[PDB]
Each structure stands twice: as C-alpha cells, then as structure tokens.
C-alpha cells in the first residue's frame, strides 16, 4: 500500500512498500589454540616412533 523512501537515478530506482506495521577471541588466544593442536600432533607422532622403537 504505502510506498516510501522513493529514490531515483539514471541506473534505476529503489523504494520500500509497507503492508502493515509491527505489534571475539584475540590473536594471542588464536595462536594458542593452533599451537595446542600442534603439540597434540607432536605427542601422537612421538608415541608412534616410541612404539616403532620398541
């Protein structure tokens, strides 16, 4: 029904039609998560080479 905020230009035009009214982590933490995962990888790899050593 009600058309509002009609704006026109050479490229086109835009508007709004209303039918009815209503009724973060830091760089420190990130580098810590990534390195904590790297240690867990290094531990698993160490256990393998330890197992293979046996």
């Amino acid at each position: 029904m009600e058309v509002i905020e009609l704006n026109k230009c050479t490229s086109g035009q835009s508007f709004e039609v209303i039918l009815k009214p209503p009724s973060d982590p830091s760089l420190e933490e990130i580098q810590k998560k990534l390195e904590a995962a790297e240690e867990r990888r290094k531990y698993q790899e160490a256990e393998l080479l330890k197992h293979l050593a046996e």
């Binding site: 086109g12 835009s14 508007f15 039918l19 209503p22």
Partner: peptide, 26 residues
C-alpha cells in the same frame, strides 16, 4: 505484491513490519 499477498502465506514476526524493500536496476 498486492496480488501475491492475498494468495500466499506470508507471516512476519510481530516485532517486524510486514513490508518489502525494493531495488531496481534498468
């Protein structure tokens, strides 16, 4: 829009206006 509104189920949340922001490029 007027035709579609009377033919389809278009439920808005109560805390939002039932409307459409239109944009046209020729």
């Amino acid at each position: 829009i007027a035709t579609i509104k009377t033919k389809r189920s278009i439920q808005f949340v109560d805390w939002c206006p039932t409307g459409f922001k239109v944009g046209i490029n020729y």
